[PDB]
Ligand binder design. Structure first.
Ligand SMILES: [Cl-]
Ligand SMILES: [Cl-]
Length: 162
């Protein structure tokens, strides 16, 4: 298992513009287009991202390309963040993937806000961090996904995804 396969499972793949769990226009593999309520604004961002007049529909290759860029950006966001970097550096491979997943989902800013959880991860207090990670809107809004990511932090294995 790896970061790509993990996120492909959590986000799924959709070739036409759709609304995410929060109701925002998205496409492909969890690629947020805009938070704006307008479909046109969404279509405009899509075309700008792909480089062609899409009409709200992309190909698989196009979805994957956005996905590669998005994963790359998540990692780079973590490494550039003063709060996140040190955590990330302290973790093993599986747990690093869990942190990337969260950043992909909520943004660096969002994750950087889990101050207490981050400290616990850094200290390697797995069970404690898992409980703390669960006391959040994130867990309450997308519990199944949250549960899978939390298990990875807790156990250091991909069991939840197998
Ligand atoms: Cl983009
Ligand atoms: Cl969920």
């Amino acid at each position: 298992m790896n970061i790509f396969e993990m996120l492909r499972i959590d986000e799924g793949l959709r070739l036409k513009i759709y609304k995410d769990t929060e109701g925002y226009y998205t496409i492909g593999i969890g690629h947020l287009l805009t938070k704006s309520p307008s479909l046109n604004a969404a279509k405009s961002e899509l075309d700008k991202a792909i480089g062609r007049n899409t009409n709200g529909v992309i190909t698989k290759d196009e979805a994957e390309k956005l996905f590669n860029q998005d994963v790359d950006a998540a990692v780079r966001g973590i490494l550039r963040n003063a709060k996140l970097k040190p955590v990330y550096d302290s973790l093993d491979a599986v747990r690093r993937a869990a942190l990337i997943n969260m950043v992909f989902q909520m943004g660096e800013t969002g994750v950087a806000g889990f101050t207490n959880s981050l400290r616990m991860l850094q200290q390697k207090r797995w069970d404690e961090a898992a409980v703390n990670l669960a006391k959040s809107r994130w867990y309450n809004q997308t519990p199944n996904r949250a549960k899978r990511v939390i298990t990875a932090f807790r156990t250091g294995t991909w069991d939840a995804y197998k």
